[PDB]
Every structure is written in structure tokens, then in C-alpha cells.
């Protein structure tokens, strides 16, 4: 791959993915081991703490990233409050593209679950969320979505023009302008045979927003039933509005 130098800068805070997967798996195993035979977390609670740990890893990614790290804390907060669930969705779909296989979901822990298990055991709301996510993964697999493009999309999600009241809105405009330009340069040089790749990638962004909102809605009802564990980042973001 020829890579725009800007995208090389963006790539510098990417984690070693399989290391992070293993760290999260080890965390969840330690959580369950700290618990007696009878106080073990439920599947749903374990999956919430997995999403929680993923969010920590996302926050560590953003706080250390070029550009983001020059913002004041209160600007950082505003950005992340806007995109946290889009970034968890984006993280998820990219993981399915590069580590996953058709027919199963690849969890951040490295474990795989057949969608047919989920279809037979989950309710309609979760099933519909899984269906929509699958459509998105299908699109991104079809496009041969890669790490260079993924990091551009993360930045375009994070530096959102939807966010009001920023102290440094100019940096958001700069990220939008310069990351779009780098992404187009990248796709045109590396996937010339896909003449519309740039625009097809960009068309996934409102779809990621929609999914993220449906996901928040699902978690919100699960919270209303007391089922979401608390004292964590995940539940705080959900309540921040």
C-alpha cells in the first residue's frame, strides 16, 4: 500500500489487536474467578463488561491520538459523548472484517458465537440489531475495508461536525477536510478498480450512526429492567445524554 503520510500519523496509535483481545478475555476470566460458584455474572452482564473494557480501550486510543490530544478536556468530553457508541459499533464491524468469518460473530475476547445461537436465544430487538450489523459487515467485507480506511473513519466519527459548543471547532473542520482528502487519495491509489470506494465508505457513516442509536435504545430498555451492570463507563455514557 502507498499510504498518505497523514494516515501514517493516524495509524501510530493503533493497538496490537490480538493483545488487546487477550487482555480483555483475561479480565473477564479474572472477574468470574473473583466470584463464587453462585455469584458469577450472567451472560448479559459479562457481555456488558466486555463492551465496558472495549470502551476503555477506545478512550485510551483517543486520548493518546494525534490532534485529539491537543484539545482541552472539556472538548474531549464533548466529542466522546457524541460518538462513543458509534466507535464501539465501528470497532465491532472492523473486527468482523479482519478477524471474523461469515456465520459467526467474533467477540473482542477472540471467542466466536454462531449467529444461529443468537437467533434462537435472543429477542427480536437484539436479533434486528444483529441483522443490521451483519448488513454493514457484508458491505465492508465486499469492499475489502482495510486498516488504513478504518483509522480514517474513526477520525471522521470522532471529529464530528454534529458537536456543538466546542472551544476548538476549527480542528474538527480541519480533520474533516484533511482526513477526507487523505482517504480519497488512499482509495484511488490502492483500490483503483473500485472507482467509488471513497464514496461507498462514506455512505456507511450514517448507517453506523443509526445502528449505534438502535444499540443505545436496546441497552436503555435493558437498563430500565435493572439488567445492565453499573459502576462503569458503559452505563455512564448511556446516562450522559
Amino acid at each position: 500500500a502507498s499510504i498518505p503520510h497523514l494516515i501514517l500519523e493516524l495509524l501510530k496509535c493503533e493497538p496490537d489487536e490480538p493483545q488487546v483481545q487477550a487482555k480483555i478475555m483475561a479480565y473477564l476470566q479474572q472477574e468470574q474467578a473473583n466470584r463464587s460458584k453462585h455469584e458469577k455474572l450472567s451472560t448479559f452482564g459479562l457481555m456488558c463488561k466486555m463492551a465496558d473494557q472495549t470502551l476503555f480501550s477506545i478512550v485510551e486510543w483517543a486520548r493518546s491520538s494525534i490532534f485529539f490530544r491537543e484539545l482541552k478536556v472539556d472538548d474531549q468530553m464533548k466529542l466522546l459523548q457524541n460518538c462513543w457508541s458509534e466507535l464501539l459499533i465501528l470497532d465491532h464491524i472492523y473486527r468482523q472484517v479482519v478477524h471474523g468469518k461469515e456465520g459467526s460473530i467474533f467477540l473482542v475476547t477472540g471467542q466466536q458465537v454462531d449467529y444461529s445461537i443468537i437467533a434462537s436465544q435472543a429477542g427480536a430487538t437484539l436479533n434486528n440489531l444483529m441483522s443490521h450489523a451483519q448488513e454493514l459487515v457484508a458491505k465492508l467485507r465486499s469492499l475489502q475495508f482495510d486498516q488504513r480506511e478504518f483509522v480514517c473513519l474513526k477520525f471522521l466519527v470522532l471529529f464530528s461536525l454534529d458537536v456543538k459548543n466546542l472551544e476548538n471547532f476549527q480542528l474538527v473542520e480541519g480533520v474533516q477536510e484533511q482526513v477526507n482528502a487523505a482517504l480519497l487519495d488512499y482509495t484511488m491509489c490502492n483500490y483503483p478498480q473500485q472507482t467509488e470506494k471513497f464514496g461507498q465508505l462514506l455512505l456507511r457513516l450514517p448507517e453506523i450512526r443509526a445502528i449505534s442509536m438502535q444499540a443505545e435504545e436496546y441497552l436503555y430498555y435493558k437498563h430500565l429492567n435493572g439488567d445492565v451492570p453499573y459502576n462503569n463507563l458503559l452505563i455512564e455514557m448511556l446516562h450522559a445524554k
Partner: peptide, 16 residues
């Protein structure tokens, strides 16, 4: 308000 600010997020971002 401050009540809805996510405490854990703020703590993470505030760290040097």
C-alpha cells in the same frame, strides 16, 4: 449538569 457528566470518562481524560 455536572450530575450527568460521566465521572469515569472525565477521570480518564483528566489524567496526564
Amino acid at each position: 449538569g455536572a450530575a450527568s457528566r460521566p465521572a469515569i470518562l472525565y477521570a480518564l481524560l483528566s489524567s496526564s
